[PDB]
Amino acid sequence: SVVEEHGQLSISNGELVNERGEQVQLKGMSSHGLQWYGQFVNYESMKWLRDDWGINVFRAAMYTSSGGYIDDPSVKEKVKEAVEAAIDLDIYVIIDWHILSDNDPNIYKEEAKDFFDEMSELYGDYPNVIYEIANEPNGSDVTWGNQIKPYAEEVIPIIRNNDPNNIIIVGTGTWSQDVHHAADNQLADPNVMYAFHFYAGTHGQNLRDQVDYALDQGAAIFVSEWGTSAATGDGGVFLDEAQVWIDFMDERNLSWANWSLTHKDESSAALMPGANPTGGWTEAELSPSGTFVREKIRES
Ligand SMILES: *[C@H]1O[C@H](CO)[C@@H](O[C@@H]2O[C@H](CO)[C@@H](O[C@@H]3O[C@H](CO)[C@@H](O)[C@H](O)[C@H]3O)[C@H](O)[C@H]2O)[C@H](O)[C@H]1F
């Protein structure tokens, strides 16, 4: 199994490596918001993804706003369920503090510190855990140097007091697209990665060149959210551009999590409406996006 084989992950010269120092690449799925589609996040559905799709990482998208954790903290228990299922299935798991409408990570920074203190105290002695402290910082007034980096410099110390070196993914500006700025002003923690998010509906040649720039500065990049659709999560399925990005990520050995595991009627959703929330999906229960993503992970 994956975690038994690769064990402790770390960053070495800007690259994600296992405990023997070998490069590793994680490929999996992200849940949709846990406050809306939490029924698809359970041991059985995760086991089906592992066994039938070949996933080696699962991302628990805990929205903070929009009816998420700040409005009802009960969703933190669903994150715990996902983490424990990943531990039982021997796969990696990303704990995502999913900011979005609350566009500056500093808005709920005290709550984030308390949440990450609890999560790292509970699960800090497992190698499966990857922390994602701010999904998608966004807005012209939310910059890397003034807002995002200082936020990370307050939250990372909290995690590091309990868990010295599991991987931490830090969001970047402009909905986690501005890896150039983060790469030119990196954080001191040696086991940090910078998030890069893309949607296949957007022509991506310059964005690929921007990721290459960041990689050239020695910044480790995790594609913690990407979709086959347009940036809204809907608007069509763009498989030609998605395949270009898949090939690019393999060439650069970039780890990734696809958005998202839900039956919602939007192009990026991986499942069709009567898909069983506990897995075992037939061909007809997978959407065009989900069919493609499953093929990409099985091929790997
Ligand atoms: C990364 O990008 C994706 C795609 O844009 C984002 O996921 C989308 O987030 C939307 C906003 O949360 C979400 O729409 C919401 O869906 C809810 C559940 O159905 C509705 O109650 C709400 O009205 C609606 O705005 C899209 O369904 C989803 O794909 C992701 O959050 C970003 F990190």
Q: What are phi and psi of 260, to 5 degrees?
A: -155, 165
Cis, peptide link before residue 229, omega less than 30° from 0: no
Is the CB of residue 66 below 6 angstroms from any atom belonging to ligand 1?
Answer: yes
H or E element in which residue 118 lies: helix 109-123
Among candidates 162, 137, 151, 170, which has minimal Cα distance to 64? 137
Helix (H) or strand (E) holding 193: strand 192-199
Contact 31, 41 (CB under 8 A): yes
d(CA 62, CA 65): 9
Write the DSSP string, 124-166. Answer: TT-TTEEEES-S---STT--IIIIIHHHHHHHHHHHHTT-SSS
Q: Whose CA is nearest to atom 18 of ligand 1?
A: 36
Rounded Cα distance between 251 and 12, Å, is: 18
DSSP string, 46-97: HHHIIIII---EEEEEEESSTTSTTT-TTHHHHHHHHHHHHHHHT-EEEEEE
Domain boundaries, the chain: 1-300
Any idea which residue has 């699962």 for tokens? Answer: 58
Which residue carries 């002003």 as its tokens? 185
**Domain covering 1-300 assigned CATH 3.20.20.80 in the classification:** yes
Residue 136: active-site member = yes
Which of 97, 133, 232 for mutating ligand 1's site (highest number of atoms within 8 Å of CB)?
Answer: 232
Gap between the Cα atoms of 118 and 159, Å rounded: 9
**How many angstroms is it from 46 CA to the middle of ligand 1?**
21
CA distance readout (Å), 117 to 114, 155, 156, 243: 5, 9, 10, 38
Mutate which of 99, 132, 175, 266 for ligand 1 pocket (most atoms within 8 A of beta carbon): 266
Query: 216: helix, coil or strand?
Result: helix
112 φ, ψ (degrees, to nearest 5): -65, -45
Angle in degrees, 0-180, between the axes of helices 109-123 and 75-89, rounded to the nearest 10: 30
Rounded CA-CA distance 225/287 in Å is 18
CA distance 32 to 264: 9
Q: Is the dihedral of CA 284, 286, 289, 295 positive or negative?
A: negative
* Bridge partner residues of 222 (DSSP): 195, 255
**Ligand 1 in reach of 127 Cβ (< 6 A):** no
- Give the three-class secondary structure for 284: helix
Coil vs helix vs strand at 248? helix
Answer left, alpha or beta for residue 175, where phi above 0 means left and psi between -120 and 50 means alpha: left
- Report whether 109 belongs to an annotated binding site: no
Residues 6+ apart with CB under 8 A from 91: 1, 2, 3, 28, 46, 50, 55, 56, 57, 58, 128
Q: Are strands 129-132 and 92-98 parallel, antiparallel or unpaired?
A: parallel
Method: X-ray
What's the CA gap between 163 and 140, in Å, rounded? Answer: 33
Alpha-carbon dihedral sign for residues 117, 119, 122, 128: negative
96-85-267-252 Cα dihedral, nearest 10 degrees = 70
Length of the chain, in residues: 300
Shortest CA distance to 202 belongs to which of 168, 166, 238?
Answer: 238
Q: What is the distance between the alpha carbons of residues 7 and 293, in angstroms, rounded to a whole number?
A: 25
The experimental resolution of this structure, in angstroms, equals 1.7
| Preceding amide of 260 cis, omega within 30 | yes
Catalytic residue among 111, 136, 153, 251: 136
